[PDB]
Amino acid sequence: GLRDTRPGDTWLADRSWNRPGWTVAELEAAKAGRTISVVLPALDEEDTIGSVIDSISPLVDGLVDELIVLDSGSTDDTEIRAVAAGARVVSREQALPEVPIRPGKGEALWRSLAASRGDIVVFVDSDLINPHPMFVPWLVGPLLTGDGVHLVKSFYRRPGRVTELVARPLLAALRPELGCILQPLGGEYAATRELLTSVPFAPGYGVEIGLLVDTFDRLGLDAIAQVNLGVREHRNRPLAELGAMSRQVIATLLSRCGIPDSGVGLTQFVADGPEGQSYTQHTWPVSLADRPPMQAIRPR
Amino acid sequence: GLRDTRPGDTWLADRSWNRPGWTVAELEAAKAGRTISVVLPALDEEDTIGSVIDSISPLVDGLVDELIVLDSGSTDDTEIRAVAAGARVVSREQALPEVPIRPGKGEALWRSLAASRGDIVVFVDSDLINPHPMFVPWLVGPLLTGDGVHLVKSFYRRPGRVTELVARPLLAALRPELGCILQPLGGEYAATRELLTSVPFAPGYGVEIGLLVDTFDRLGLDAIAQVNLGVREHRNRPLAELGAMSRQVIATLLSRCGIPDSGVGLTQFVADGPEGQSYTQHTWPVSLADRPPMQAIRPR
Numbered sequence: 001g002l003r004d005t006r007p008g009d010t011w012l013a014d015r016s017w018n019r020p021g022w023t024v025a026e027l028e029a030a031k032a033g034r035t036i037s038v039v040l041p042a043l044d045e046e047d048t049i050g051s052v053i054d055s056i057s058p059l060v061d062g063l064v065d066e067l068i069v070l071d072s073g074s075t076d077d078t079e080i081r082a083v084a085a086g087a088r089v090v091s092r093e094q095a096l097p098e099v100p101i102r103p104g105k106g107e108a109l110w111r112s113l114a115a116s117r118g119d120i121v122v123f124v125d126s127d128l129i130n131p132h133p134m135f136v137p138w139l140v141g142p143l144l145t146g147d148g149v150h151l152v153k154s155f156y157r158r159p160g161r162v163t164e165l166v167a168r169p170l171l172a173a174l175r176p177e178l179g180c181i182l183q184p185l186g187g188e189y190a191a192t193r194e195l196l197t198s199v200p201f202a203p204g205y206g207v208e209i210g211l212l213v214d215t216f217d218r219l220g221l222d223a224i225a226q227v228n229l230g231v232r233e234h235r236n237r238p239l240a241e242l243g244a245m246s247r248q249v250i251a252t253l254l255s256r257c258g259i260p261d262s263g264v265g266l267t268q269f270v271a272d273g274p275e276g277q278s279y280t281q282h283t284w285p286v287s288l289a290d291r292p293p294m295q296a297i298r299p300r
Numbered sequence: 301g302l303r304d305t306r307p308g309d310t311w312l313a314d315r316s317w318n319r320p321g322w323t324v325a326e327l328e329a330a331k332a333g334r335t336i337s338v339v340l341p342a343l344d345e346e347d348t349i350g351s352v353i354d355s356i357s358p359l360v361d362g363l364v365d366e367l368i369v370l371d372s373g374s375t376d377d378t379e380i381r382a383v384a385a386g387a388r389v390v391s392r393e394q395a396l397p398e399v400p401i402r403p404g405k406g407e408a409l410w411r412s413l414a415a416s417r418g419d420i421v422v423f424v425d426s427d428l429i430n431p432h433p434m435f436v437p438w439l440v441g442p443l444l445t446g447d448g449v450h451l452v453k454s455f456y457r458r459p460g461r462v463t464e465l466v467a468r469p470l471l472a473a474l475r476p477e478l479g480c481i482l483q484p485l486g487g488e489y490a491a492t493r494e495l496l497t498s499v500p501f502a503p504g505y506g507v508e509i510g511l512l513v514d515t516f517d518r519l520g521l522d523a524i525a526q527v528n529l530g531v532r533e534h535r536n537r538p539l540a541e542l543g544a545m546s547r548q549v550i551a552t553l554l555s556r557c558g559i560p561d562s563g564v565g566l567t568q569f570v571a572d573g574p575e576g577q578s579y580t581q582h583t584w585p586v587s588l589a590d591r592p593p594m595q596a597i598r599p600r
Contacts, residue, residue: 176564264476
């Protein structure tokens with residue numbers, strides 16, 4: 001199974017593999033009333049967002065009913081380049097005006113649920129370097145082929161740290177049944193509205209891991225599927241930021257397991273010089289504050 | 301305080317700093333009946349162990365009463381080179397013959413307590429590249445200056461991953477008072493026999509973190525001190541092994557916080573080729589089995 005996996009292959013919970021034998025046009029016919037939205041979270045991604053939209057553009061009005069870029073308050077030319085590429089840009093303010101804004105990635109994806117319409121929502125990171133046009137079709141594949149799948153995660157390889165050292169070892173310890181998930185923190189995934197609007201949304205970088213665990217806890221492993229995207233390349237995350245990401249992943253995962261987190265942020269001690277004669281104390285923020293299920297805020 | 305710290309400076313719990321104003325000969329007089337042992341855990345370290353012993357050698361018969369190398373069943377020339385350097389080599393079998401051997405670093409340090417004699421035991425890794433001769437004197441410093449210190453941890457800088465992404469963020473979440481510890485996983489530390497033989501010893505790579513938390517939980521932060529070793533350089537740990545280390549650090553830390561760990565090892569999925577057409581499934585072992593306080597096995 002894992003000894004022969006092509007980009008597009010689905011791995012179900014019962015250790016069974018499913019190789020897709022459809023075209024894009026055939027998948028559109030398999031929708032049968034169900035609508036598909038694609039959401040792209042964006043914070044200062046002016047260089048990459050054009051290319052990401054272009055790979056999903058030809059699917060619009062066909063398989064994809066709406067392509068939305070959720071602007072997380074960008075100060076650069078992210079908005080004007082995304083419109084020029086042919087996607088509707090909705091800011092956090094515009095997505096849900098009647099609720100004050102909290103910082104972080106989790107807030108943006110949560111708000112995109114109120115801004116989107118589709119029965120199936122596809123999430124793709126806007127910092128992906130040259131994504132394959134079949135990314136979206138592969139993600140919706142297991143959902144449109146009705147077999148009780150509600151969340152489609154993705155796995156890939158670089159042409160890592162927090163996934164391999166924090167997320168996955170902690171999942172092995174606390175939710176061992178989720179040990180088969182190759183990329184729990186992966187930003188490329190698809191889910192049904194009925195699931196997305198019924199679960200709370202974790203703040204910041206904990207959004208992916210929280211959604212994965214909530215899906216497993218309330219539906220079981222059978223509702224989760226994994227698709228091979230082949231080779232994924234994205235903007236490299238700065239090494240200083242990974243400690244903060246880890247702490248948030250930890251906070252979110254502990255809260256889902258009923259383990260009380262102190263709410264105390266990670267303090268990093270950065271050496272000022274080569275000798276190490278002095279250290280800079282830097283405390284990253286951490287949030288234990290989930291957003292409630294969207295059904296409690298804006299019921300569709 | 302952290303804006304001016306020279307190699308040797310002690311950081312106490314009450315955020316107060318102590319700069320040492322002694323010589324090696326003056327520290328020996330401060331012992332007053334108390335004996336000091338230095339333990340070097342060794343598993344296949346034939347290239348580095350000679351240099352490590354040479355830095356501690358001139359202290360023997362003076363400040364250091366005995367220098368012991370705890371051989372963890374080496375297959376190379378670790379034993380014969382350590383004897384030639386001038387240190388007594390005790391294997392796991394010889395350290396505690398009447399108890400069967402378990403694999404891992406934690407077992408070795410635990411067994412060294414039965415093989416050692418000193419009221420103060422100093423632990424130094426045998427894979428250190430050119431350690432400073434003042435390493436041992438700096439570690440025993442706060443212990444010999446009687447102010448209620450029972451464990452001396454160390455901090456340094458490279459001339460990281462698991463410390464910065466796993467150990468420290470998880471300590472912030474579960475034991476926030478230990479957030480000021482710069483290197484919780486550091487192999488260079490010293491403690492009193494009364495403490496070391498009264499606490500359980502965590503298996504494998506969890507030994508350091510377990511000892512830190514046990515000391516805090518039963519004595520408080522006042523018993524823990526930190527010393528600047530300046531610049532530390534050691535053999536680089538292979539990137540494939542760090543996931544296994546993380547899982548063990550996680551298992552040990554959760555167990556100390558009363559959080560049930562599943563006992564399921566981390567499964568890593570390693571890509572076989574460039575395309576990612578197949579994956580190798582690799583499950584690292586994890587142990588939830590502590591060793592009991594040495595007072596329950598060999599009471600001195």
